[PDB]
Design a protein around this nucleic acid. Sequence first.
DNA 1: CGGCTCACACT
DNA 2: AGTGTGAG
Length: 428
Amino acid sequence: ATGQDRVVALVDMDCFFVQVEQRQNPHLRNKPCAVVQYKSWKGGGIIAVSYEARAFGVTRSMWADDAKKLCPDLLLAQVRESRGKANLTKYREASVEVMEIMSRFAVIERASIDEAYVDLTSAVQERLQKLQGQPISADLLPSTYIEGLPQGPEETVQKEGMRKQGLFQWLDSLQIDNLTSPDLQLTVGAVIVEEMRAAIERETGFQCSAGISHNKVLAKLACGLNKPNRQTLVSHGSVPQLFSQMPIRKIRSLGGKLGASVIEILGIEYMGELTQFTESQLQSHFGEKNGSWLYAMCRGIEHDPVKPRQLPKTIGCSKNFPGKTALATREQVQWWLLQLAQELEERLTKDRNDNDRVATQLVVSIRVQGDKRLSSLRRCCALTRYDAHKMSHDAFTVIKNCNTSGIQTEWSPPLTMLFLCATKFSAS
DNA sequence: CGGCTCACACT
DNA sequence: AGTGTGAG
Ligand SMILES: Nc1ccn([C@H]2C[C@H](O)[C@@H](COP(=O)(O)NP(=O)(O)OP(=O)(O)O)O2)c(=O)n1
Ligand SMILES: [Mg+2]
Ligand SMILES: [Mg+2]
């Protein structure tokens, strides 16, 4: 079991929110640009950054005023604001454009607003059959990188030169006659991804990057290797060298506490080092599921299927009221619950029309001042009507007990966060 | 005051 | 049903 059974691709839009703004606002194109929200506080928080802007060191989770210091000419596009909160509708709609195009080629799993996993196994089989021993031209893979290539013995000075040489080595090595071979399958998968990315760009004007491999983790990792506007094929064989110097945190789901735990407990830095441990050893340290996943993953093997899901399982609205802005009155809490409910209602109504389904559960989450937990309390009630007033009213009923204060016209402790989430969808 | 938004494991 | 982790 070499985990070479599937052909999986992860496609991620390059600086997605920026591209959406750049398409709509042509003046932003091919310039250091960022997308920000909530301009009032420090010029707004940057949530997307063009590659021209990244050259100046501008990053996500950076204040616009600070970004300006690094990049004086940085152009900014503001996230739409509705009812006192950021509205992401344009980006969701832009996302739908991309997802629908991708869906034409194969079943997709919407991993995020700007990326999706594709299981191309079946599509590859069909493509392999359509061409009988047809040699795969380099022209079919104009933006493809083969990780780990070129290897061995002035063209390579340029990145395009390196890409070509690597591709040539790979293609020269490829034997068409073996329809079964995983490398061949990955290659054909890459050809389809080229087509998928060309279609996306032609039809949306959005550029994207892609990773092609035998699983989701490798595909996602591969995608990031040659961003932007490029796709990378990571073969099973490329894994040992790739993982040998690959920081553990870089593997998906290893970015947080578990990753640090793996590093600290095992005293290792790289993904490859995990191979020297028995599955039982890994299981003992990190649990049954994690241990087995780690044992297989460090060998480039993962079995997490590409879920056939294009739609979010939940629709959520929330707002932060940090520090001084915390809501300390009942009226204040009710008004904000209403604003969140109103946006939620609009999105829910659209969802029902577009997707033939209804949310049956309303989830309410709040944060009181002095908690470092993202959520202080979680509570749920039935969502029976797509009405903002009822939903906000119900949400308030569910969380009204949290209010310590006797006066009751005041709210204590003050709420630093309000969250409304529609869940438990059903067909209709 | 890196904000808003999802998915999912564990209990 | 609720809490926490991880991600984008
Ligand atoms: N913390 C984050 C991460 C992403 N996003 C949004 C903005 C991003 O443009 C979009 C996609 O996330 P992302 O793929 O990780 N980064 P982005 O697409 O902007 O650039 P790339 O590095 O992928 O090329 O989700 C966000 O709002 N908050
Ligand atoms: Mg992206
Ligand atoms: Mg992404």
